[PDB]
Amino acid sequence: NAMANVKLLLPYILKWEGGFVHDPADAGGATNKGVTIATWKRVGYDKDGDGDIDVEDLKLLTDDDVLNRVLKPFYWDRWKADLIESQKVANILVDWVWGSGKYGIVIPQRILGVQADGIVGNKTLQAVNSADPDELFESIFDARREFLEDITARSIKKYEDSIGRKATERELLRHTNKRFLRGWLNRLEDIRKL
């Protein structure tokens, strides 16, 4: 009867939004900044029903403030993830909403065969927990790959339609979601490893 725990998702969110790593204490404990794949409200995000939580820069808050004031109330609890019994299922659903907003509810609702109304009610939660956790995680993972590829293909199409010709690779990396796709997919793959 173990429930998913938001605390286990937090390090993953912080890792990729911040790009920080810390030296251990006896080396001086320096915070070092490197590869960053920040997705908060950035990945084809639909803000409808998100509560309008914003901060100037997540990197300037404590871990506890990110957890208690942003991630748990507005994202984790939006999936009622305290009632999701599979940690990995909760992780991948909540992270989808973190990056993409309402899409991270409505697409899973379609996968689950429940009304895709963007509200996680009892029927949606029942469907999540009734599913085999491994099967459901993989189906969500398939759909998240599909989503990232789809918003990238559409971004490329919009741009090429606008310029009236095929874009160069340089143009696509400057002007479209192709810029972000590698990082988005790599960050997604990393969620399997929690």
The answer to whether the beta carbons of residues 23 and 32 sit under 8 Å apart is yes
The conformation of residue 60, written as its DSSP 8-state character, comes to G
Helix (H) or strand (E) holding 183: helix 178-190
Burial bucket for residue 157 (CB in 10 Å: 0-12, 13-18, 19+): exposed
Q: Kindly list the distances between the CA atom of residue 72 and the CA atoms of 13, 44, 53, 94, 168, in Å, as whole numbers in the listed order.
A: 12, 21, 11, 9, 42
The CA distance from 29 to 97, in Å, is 33
Q: How many domains does the chain have?
A: 1
Structural domain boundaries, residue 173: 1-194
Q: How many CB atoms lie within 10 A of CB 181?
A: 19
Residue-wise DSSP of 66-128 = HIIIIIIIIIIGGGTGGG-S-HHHHHHHHHHHHHHBTHHHHHHHHHHTS---S---HHHHHHH
Contacts of 26 (CB under 8 A, 6+ apart): none
Question: What tokens were used for 87?
Answer: 């940690």
Q: What is the CA radius of gyration of the chain?
A: 18
Q: What is the CATH number of the domain that holds 98?
A: 1.20.141.10
State the structure-solving technique.
Answer: X-ray
Q: Return the DSSP state at 27.
A: G
For residue 177, give the 3-state DSSP assignment: coil
**What are the Cα distances from residue 64, in Å, to 7, 74, 108, 129, 158?**
10, 14, 29, 28, 40
Question: What does the alpha-carbon distance between residue 29 and residue 172 come to, in Å, rounded to a whole number?
Answer: 39
Query: Resolution in angstroms, to 1 decimal, for this deposition?
Result: 1.3
